[model samples]
Target: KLVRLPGLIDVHVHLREPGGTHKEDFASGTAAALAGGITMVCAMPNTRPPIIDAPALALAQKLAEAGARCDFALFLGASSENAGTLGTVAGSAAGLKLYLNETFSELRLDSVVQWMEHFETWPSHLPIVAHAEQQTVAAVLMVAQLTQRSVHISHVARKEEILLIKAAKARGLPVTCEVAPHHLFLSHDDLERLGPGKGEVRPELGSRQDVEALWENMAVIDCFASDHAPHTLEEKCGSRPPPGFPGLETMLPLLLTAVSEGRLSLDDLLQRLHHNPRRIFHLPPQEDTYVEVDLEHEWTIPSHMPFSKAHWTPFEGQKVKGTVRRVVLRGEVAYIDGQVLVPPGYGQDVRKWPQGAVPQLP
Candidate 1:
């Protein structure tokens, strides 16, 4: 009798290394991933020095290889400052990352002209993952020119934007998008209730109606992401501040609880958490990794027991009926009984890119 299912993938996460270790580093980040029963993670590259060039990208790979505790791959940045390195950077990552809206205000296109020209030059086959928010509609138009490439949108929160994406797909556009667990479980009123702590996320959560539309559109969305952004409560509620919440540990449980509540199905959970990532990113299947959870087990939300460095979750105190009991990675029991079996540096890197794919003339 299996308590949980196998193959969990988190397409977006902030492992915070090569710069922001004071907040969350590769080792600590991967520690949370393994404990949470996540088999694969794609770490976002928005650190100091930014992974916008070949050297920095290579350095990030090296760091992950040295310390990452779960099967991991990286996404590189494409920005105006390091635009010349696009070819090399593209060859290094599963895809390119850009925040079209001024979210973290990092890795943005300098100009719309520059962005469009860059998209045109790159063969449309290359994938670009955009952090879409304010400029989502505009970004869709801009990406339309690169018909051959695949575009992945992240952190979708509004109903209007979902309709825009739905229209783009209906018209035969090559675009995909992801919605986070927080957006599905919590709403604007919940944020207001949490007050200062909830101020971490931008776009400031949405009305209940907006979130309801998000759920309605979930089936068509490409995948479900944790967006697993971690920040210390002190920094979030402190004098010197930051944005975002820790979702790594709670990600799976929350989704499973949603499953038990009829909001999502087991099939959808498997597709979003596993199948869609491999299909979109072209990642190879892992033959030996799996996670098993007790779907029927009832557990009270604990104020502690968080694996992330941040030590708190927005979903805290919400009683959920599912729990992850064990996980097996590469034939090893990596996690069981609410604790990760493997120590830091126990995981490996998943490299899909080859050395010869860099910058060749068509």
Candidate 2:
């Protein structure tokens, strides 16, 4: 049977533009997104310049408008200095990405009280997307509770973190979190096969028990994100390999395969990939956005692929049972079989969250 579903919206992706075009840019990144059944992606702001202020956000918007092939909106990086400017730019961005620990950029704010203060100054309706680790997840939740603002934890990798999120959600906290496909599908054991650079990811892959805990607590998780961080092979294979991997092209097929194996229901898949993301980000429904998939098509991921400039995948050579047959963006075919039908600049900005729409904790 053919499977048709609403276009997937990935809430976390790193399209390295405005700085690292050699790694990935809006055009190539969004094209790759469409090829894997994603219609929209909420791009993180950790590029070369880092989208920290109003002018930077505007520039990123302009670049996306000129180059992106699918719908896009960017996160405004949050630091101690930008807490005041957040109110001014809240209307223009998808959300604020708060880095508790350094990753690609040095925009980290390590103090929980300071993070809470930043939240106190932020517009209630815009989400504070957090890059938190183990104890930091708990700290973020505490600050979110204290400030009574909505927060979205990104790429949660540990079981303890899941339990923390579950407890907070149960307490009626306006907290939502995302787990990456790599965290759900891969564990530390796979690192041996991946060697150094290929398997290395921030928050690092968890234990087998942690991976199993993610599946066990899937009902509590709000959505799934690719955390589609791409780095060139030369950079990745260097002495100090970067901590991200290319995921946009493989996220859906892997999840569909999980469905085929009876790991999760079709409805669950739809919620994580489509409905929840739309609700969490306040994205308007698009009647024309949808994807057609072949449930029985089994194929191996190739070592090289078009669309993403990275040209490599951590899941190389892995056979998956489901495949994307076609992708429609705003009623137009953006990807069919293996070809991208849309041109650069076909994407539109998706900054639709209403001011003061942020939900409050009960």
Candidate 3:
């Protein structure tokens, strides 16, 4: 079956540049994103030096300007030191990434005062994306409510967290969030089986009930982001394995499989992947962009060296339907039948777009 869909957008991804180049760089990560029909991606700022301030943000901008193969934006990380000054670089960023819960990076904000400061000062037009998990999810909502600023929660997994978000949205607190493919598909039982730290991820994969709760409350999910954190196998097998997975290439396929099974609708997927992301992130549209997919193609995921430098994925060897046959970006054939025709500097920085919400014209 031939299907033409709007070019997808991923509001969250960790490119691992300026730090773990061996794990993933702008060039490789964007290529993987193109393979999944993602024309634009907003990368996180949890690198070695982290894209926290102006110089660090400029460094990340230089690397992406030199190498990314698809349209992109860099997220500015929030920390205690940079709390009051984030407004200075808001224009150059996709959004402010606030790590409210425990994670591999040191960007976590433990103090409610620090969170309040960021919410209070960040420009209202752009979003303040939060990495709040479980209890912190409520904390984030409370801060957003108090500051009267909108927030986008990242990688919501557990039952309680998502349910809380649903209720918060019901009360109309201007809160929105994303659900990762891993948490939607994999559960803690899978974790016990895929030992050696391969099953690790933030907000750690929840119970089957948690996964089901997410599926049941899909209406509350504003978007789907891969949370595409890539780590090499050696590191994954080490005493300290990182909590992340390479998901850019697998996100669309997995979601399409759900569509094939009647568990999801194309309208819902597009709304989450394209429409909502563009509106929430204040991103401009890729005017002549679209992806052609064969929703009936059933195949097993690659087990080695996918586009990401991480070279592995938790979804490897899993049978999935749906595949991207072609991807057109701004009227150019950037990816076709599994080949990335674009070069390393092919992608444009979306933050450079005019400071206004763009038209929805196709």
Instruction: Go through the candidates in order and give the C-alpha RMSD of each one to the true structure.
Output: 2.7, 2.4, 2.7
- Candidate 2 lDDT over 118-226, as tens digits, reads 7888778767799999998998888887787789999999999999999988888888889999998889888888888888788799999999999999998889999
Best by lDDT: 3
Please, what are the lDDT tens digits per residue for candidate 3 over residues 1-362?
Answer: 68999999999998989988999999999999999999999999999888889999999999998999899989998887887687667878888888887754468676899889888877777778988888989988898889887889999999999999999988978988999999999998787667859887897999999999999999999999999999998989789888888899999999999999999899999999999998888888887999999998999987753588888888877789999999999888999987899999988898786743323333
Task: Kindly report which residue pairs in candidate 3 clash with one another.
Answer: none
Candidate 1's displacement at residue 360, Å, is: 12
> What are the clashing pairs of model 1?
3-293, 4-293, 124-148, 124-149
**lDDT (Cα atoms) of all candidates against the true structure:** 0.75, 0.87, 0.88
Tell me the tens digit of each residue's lDDT in model 1 across 1-362. 45657768898998888887866888888778877778889888788768877888888888888777777878877677655447645755767777666644567676766566556654455666877775565565566545455678887788877877888788887778888878777887786657765456854577798799988988668888888888777777787556777777888888889889998899898899898987787665666778888888877666544577776678768778777778888788888876777766766666643421324357
Would you list the rank order by lDDT, best first?
Answer: 3, 2, 1
TM-score of each candidate structure, all chains considered together = 0.92, 0.95, 0.96
Clashes of 1: 4
